[PDB]
C-alpha cells in the first residue's frame, strides 16, 4: 500500500513482483534503479510463475475506460507532429514531457488515476491512441501531407524494414544505428510504438466505416460518410501492406501482430503467397508456444504438400530431438538425396515421444533446434551435411543464418579452454576484450531481440574469460565491475518493453540473462563469498514452471559450471556450489526427460554422476535417491521398462533401510505400482508367481517378494472371496507404502481407494473354523443346510432365525457376526485409511478430498449397522475443514431411518458451526421455517445461537421480512385465474380465503381498494371481479422503496452465499430502492452493502422452486475443482463461470447477480439498428416476424399454406430459408467486438485464447449435463477477460427434446460463435480443449455419478417441476461413451467429432425454434 503512491511467503512475493514490474517503467530513474534491485532478489520460481497480476490489470482497465469514452478532440497538430517525429526519426523536439503533454491536453470543463500518471507505459499508450484518433478524425489530413502521402510514408518505412529483415545487410538509417546504448533500446521502443499505432489506426477505420456495439462511441456523420465511400481503398491498402507488416512484426519480436495480420490475410483470401503466409504464421505461433493453433492450421490447410507443419508443432511443444529428425526426413524426401545425420535411434526416439523457401526454412529450423539443446557436435555435423547437399544440388539459396564463430566460442568456453575461447571472441563484433563504458554495443546493430541476446551473451563470456585470466583486489576488478554493471543495465530493456504492453508474463531468456549478469557481478566483487552470487533457479520451479522449455536451465548451467571450475582458483572460504550444481543438473534432466530429449537427458545424468538402447542399461544400471529415481525414469522412457522396474525395486529395497527415507520410499513405491498397473497383462504371471511363492522366479518377482516381506493388516482370509491373486500384491504394496511413510497423504489415499473399489465388488458379489464351530455348537445334510443358510445372503436377524428354524427343523449368532465382520473388513480398512488421510489434511487436491468425503457419506448412509464402531468414533474427531464441500448432502440426509446416524450428522454439523457459522446459517434458518427433520434443525439453530444469539435473531427477522416482501400481485393473479376458470362454491371459497389472508404499502392498498370485500359479498347472492381485475391490470403498467415495503443497519450477518470467502463480509445496509424486471415472473432486483463498502446486487424470485439450481451450481463447482492440476501449467485457465443461488423456502429464492457480462443478443440488436439507419439514410423486426416474412412465400411456392402444422413442413424449404437468412447477417459481430474491446495485440491473443477455451469447456459441460434453450439472451460474455457465462438453467437434463419444438443440437454453435474462434474454426484449440475436458471428465466420472445419485435422493428437490433414474442413466451413458450406441464405446476423439458434426450440420439447425435465432 505504501508503494505506488504519488509521493516519491509466495502470496506477498507475487504482489511484490507485480509492483516491481509496474514500477520498472517510471519517470524517475531512482525509482527504477531501486525496484530493479528488489526484483533481482526474488527467486525465478516466483518471477516466472503464471500467477495473475492485478497491477497490470488496473492499467488495462484504465486504458479501456479511456478508449471507450467519447473522443475529446483536444490533440493539436503539433503534438501529433512531435509524436510522429519521435517514432519515425527518434527526435522528440521537447526537453517528464509526456506528463506535461497529457496535462495540457486535458480540460477542466469537460479520468485516469493520478497514481498511474507516473508510468511511462500508460502515457505512451494514451499518446498513441490520441494520435490515432486525431489522424482518423482529420480524414487522414495530417501534417505529413495529403491523405495518400501518409500511406506512402508508412508504406515505405514498412517496406524498408521488411527488406532489412530479409537481408540483414541493408542497415536501414534511423533504425539500426545508435550513438550509445540508449539509442539501441529506443529503436526497439519506437518500432513497438509504430506497430501499436498501425493497429489502432486499423481499429479506428473499421469503427468509422462499420461501427461497434457499446465498446466505442460512433464517430460523427461526416466521418462515417467519408469512410463509408472510401472503405475499398483502405481495405486494398491494408491488404497490400499486410505481407510486409508480418515481417516487421516478426523482426520486432511481437508475434501477436503478425499472427493477427496473417489470420486477416487468410480470411480475406476468399477467392504463390499462400505458402509463405502459412509458413510465417506457423513460425509466429511457434514463437508464442501455441502448438494447438499450429495443428489447427495444418488440418485447415490439408483441405486446400503441407505435411511439415505438424513437425513444427512438435518444436513448439518443447520436443527438439523429434523435431530435428522430422525436419531431416522432410528435407530428404523433398530434395531426393540423403540428408540425414548421425543421431539417436529413431525406433527409440519416436517411442519416447518443394519450394526454394521451404527447404531453407526447414534447414534453419533444424539448425536452431540443434543449437537450443546445446549440441555443438551435432551443429558441426549438420553444417557439413548442408554444405555437401548444397554443393551436390547447386541450391544457391540453402544457407544457414547462424553465426558459426559465436557457436565455436560457446563450444570452447563450455569445454574449459579459455585461450581458444579468447582467440575466437577476438573476431566477434563489439568492444574489445577487457585489459568506453557508456557505449558497449556496436554500431549497425539491428533492432531484433536475438541480436541483443547474442551481444549480451558475448559480453558475459568476455567478462568471464577476463576474470578467469586475472585470477591466475583492485587491479583487474574495477573494470570488470563497471563492465558487468553496464551489461546489467542493458539487459533490463526487454523487461521494460514487456511491461509497456499488457503481457501478464516476462521473457524467460531476458530474465535469465539478467540474473546471470547479476550473479557474475556479485561473484567478481565478492570472490564467491556470499550466497547472492548463485542463480536463484531452484528445484521449486518444478511444480510452478512446467510450461517453459529446458533452455533457461542450460543457460544457467553454462555459468554454474564455470563458477564451479573457477572455485579451484580460490584459497579463502567459499560458498558450496556443488549442491547448487547437482540441483540444477537434476532439475534440468527431469525437464528434458519430460519432453522426449533422451540425448540431452543422458548427457545431464552423466554430468551429474561424474546412441543405442543397450548402452543405457549398461551405463546406468542428499541427492542420491532422487538421482536413482531419475535414472530409472530415464530408462523407462527409452523403452526398457523391465530394467527400469528392476532398478526401482532394488533402490526401494535400500531406501527401506535408510535413515530418513520419508519422501523417497513413497515415490519409489508409487511409481513402481503405477508402472506395474500399466503392464498388467505382461506382469500378471509374475504377480501370480509371487503370490504362490508366498505360500510354499524372475528377478523382478524375487526382488518384490523381499520388499513385501519386509519386517515391521490385510489377511489372505478377507481377500479369498472374489479377489484376484495379482491384485493382492498391489494391495500389499499400498499398505507397505502407507506404513513406511505415515506423513504422506498419497500413501493413504491409494490404499483407501484400492480397499474401497475391492470391498464394493466383494460385498456386491457376496449378496475352516466356521464349520468346526458350527459342528461343536450343534452337537450329514443338516450340517450342509445350516452352513448354506448361515452364509446365504449375509430385519435380518429375524429372517435368518426363521430360515434356520425352517431348515434344521443358539450359536449361529456368533457365526453370522464373524462372517459379516470378515466380509466388511475391506470397508473398515478403507474407512480407517480415509479418516487418516482426512486428518492429515486438516497437501492434496480439493477433488481428492471431496471424493473421500462422498465415499464416507455413501458408506454411512448405505451400510450403517454393519460398520458402526468405525464411523461413530471417526466422525467425533474428524476436522471440520475438509467437510465444507458436502454440507447440502449432509443436510439432505437428516431423515435417514436411523437414530445414531442422525445424531452423528447433527453433531458434525454443530461442530462445523463453530469457527464457520456463516456456511450453515441460511440453510438451517430456512429449514426451521416431521419431527425427524425438525428437531435436528432446532438443535442446530440453538447451538448456533449459543454463541451470538443477536445474529440469529436478526437473520430470522430478515428472512421473515424477505418472505413477507414477496399483495396486489397475488390479488391480480387470483382474479385472473378465477376469471379464466369462471366458465360457484369453489370461487366463493377461494375469494373468502384470499380476503382473509389480506386482512405502509398495505395501508395505502387497503385505503384505495377496500371495497373489494363488500363488492364480493354483494355479488355472492359478477361485474365486480371484472372491474377489479381491469383496475389492477391498468395500475400495473416497477420501482419500489424499501422503507415503504424493516430496514436495518450495522448488521453482523454474513452475505447470502460466501463459500469461497476466507474473511466473511457482514451485511452493512440494504438498497433503498428495488427494481422489477419484465422477464416473465416479476423479479425483484435488490442490492446489498457489505462491511467492505462493496456493492453486491441480487435477484429475488418468488413462487418458483430453486432447489435444483443450487445442486447444479454445486456440480459445476465440483467439476471446476478437477481443473486445479491442469491449470498449473497452462496459460488459458480451464474454468466454468457460475453464480450462486440460495433458496428461501419452497417457492422463494435469491440469486447472485453477475456484473460485467453482456448478452449476445445486444450485438445483433445493435447491428439491426445500424443496418436500419443506414438503409433509411440512403423498431427492428423480431426473431419471429422476420422468420415468418420468409417462411410464408416459401411455403406458398410449393403449394402448402401457413395453416399446416409445423410438423408437416418440407425440409428443403426450411433449409432454403435458413440459408437465405444466414447470408444476410454477417459473422464479424463477436469477432470484431472482442478485437475492438482489447487494447493491444498481445492482449487480443490472450482474450481470444481464453474465449476459445471457455467456449469449449462450457460446450462440453452443457452437452454432458444436457443444457437447453441456449438462446442469445441466455449467453453472456465477459469482454474484460473474454469468458462465456450461462444464467438460465430451467431447461436441462434433456428437457428440450420434449418441448413443442424439439432441439437436436447438443450445444449452441452458430456462424458467429464459430467465426469468433479464428480462421481455423473448430479444428484448432477448440477441438483439443474439448478432448482434454472430456478426458478429465472421464477420469473422474465416479465422483460425478455419486454426486448426481445424491441429488436424485433429495427430498427437497422437485424433479417434476422414475424420471430421476432415467436422467441419471442418461448422464452415465454419456460419460461412459455409449450415448449413440450402447454396444460400442466411442473414444474421446470420436465423441468430440460426432458432437461437433451434429451441432454444426445445417439439417438440424433448419428445424429449430425461431426464438433460438440459428441465423447468428
Ligand atoms: C438483456 C436482458 N438480460 C438477460 C436475460 S438481464 O437479465 O437484464 C442481465 C443479466 C445479467 N446477469 C445475471 N447474473 C445472474 C443471473 C442472471 C439471471 C437473469 C435472468 N434469469 C435468471 C434465472 C431465472 C430462472 C432460473 N431458474 C428456473 O427457471 N427454474 C428453477 C435461474 C436463473 C438469472 N443474470 C447481466 C446483464 C444483463 Cl443485461
Ligand atoms: O516424477 P515427477 O517429476 O515427480 O512428476 C510426477 C509425474 O511425472 P511423470 O509423468 O513424468 O512420471 C506426474 O506429473 P505429470 O505427468 O502430471 O506432469 C504426476 O502424476 P501422473 O504420473 O499421474 O501424471 C505426479 O506423479 P503422481 O501420480 O505420483 O502424483 C508427479 O509428481 P510425484 O510423482 O512426486 O507425485
Author numbering: 766 to 773, 791 to 877, 881 to 895, 900 to 1060, 1067 to 1099, 1103 to 1151, 1178 to 1259, 1269 to 1305, ...
Article, verbatim:
The PI3K-related kinase (PIKK) SMG1 monitors the progression of metazoan nonsense-mediated mRNA decay (NMD) by phosphorylating the RNA helicase UPF1. SMG1 is a member of the phosphatidylinositol-3-kinase-related kinase (PIKK) family, which also includes the ATM, ATR, DNA-PKc, and mTOR kinases. Despite the confounding name reflecting a possible evolutionary origin with a lipid kinase, and in retrospect the ability of some PIKK family members to bind inositol-6-phosphate, all active PIKKs are Ser-Thr protein kinases. These large, multidomain enzymes share an overall similar architecture: a C-terminal catalytic module (comprising the so-called FAT, kinase, and FATC domains) and an N-terminal α-solenoid (that typically serves as a protein-protein interaction module). SMG8 and SMG9 form an unusual G-domain heterodimer.
In this manuscript, we reported a reconstruction of the SMG1-8-9 complex bound to an SMG1 inhibitor. While many of the SMG1 residues interacting with SMG1i are conserved within the PIKK family, two contact sites appear to be specific: SMG1 Pro2213 and Asp2339 contact the sulfonamide moiety of the inhibitor while Asn2356 forms hydrogen bonds with the phenyl urea/carbamide group. Superposition of the SMG1 active site in the SMG1i-bound structure with the active site of mTORΔN shows that the corresponding residues have diverged and would not be able to mediate analogous interactions with the SMG1i sulfonamide group (mTOR Thr2245 and Ser2342 at the positions of SMG1 Pro2213 and Asp2339) or with the urea group (mTOR Gly2359 at the position of SMG1 Asn2356). Taken together, these observations rationalize the specificity of SMG1i for SMG1 over mTORΔN that we observed in the in vitro assays. Superposition with other PIKKs suggests the presence of potentially similar discriminatory interactions: like mTOR, DNA-PK lacks a favorable interaction site for the SMG1i urea group (Gly3943 at the position of SMG1 Asn2356). Finally, mTOR, DNA-PK, and ATR active sites have a different relative orientation of the kinase N- and C-lobes as compared to SMG1, changing the overall chemical environment at the SMG1i-binding site. We conclude that subtle differences in the SMG1 structure underpin the specificity of the SMG1i inhibitor.
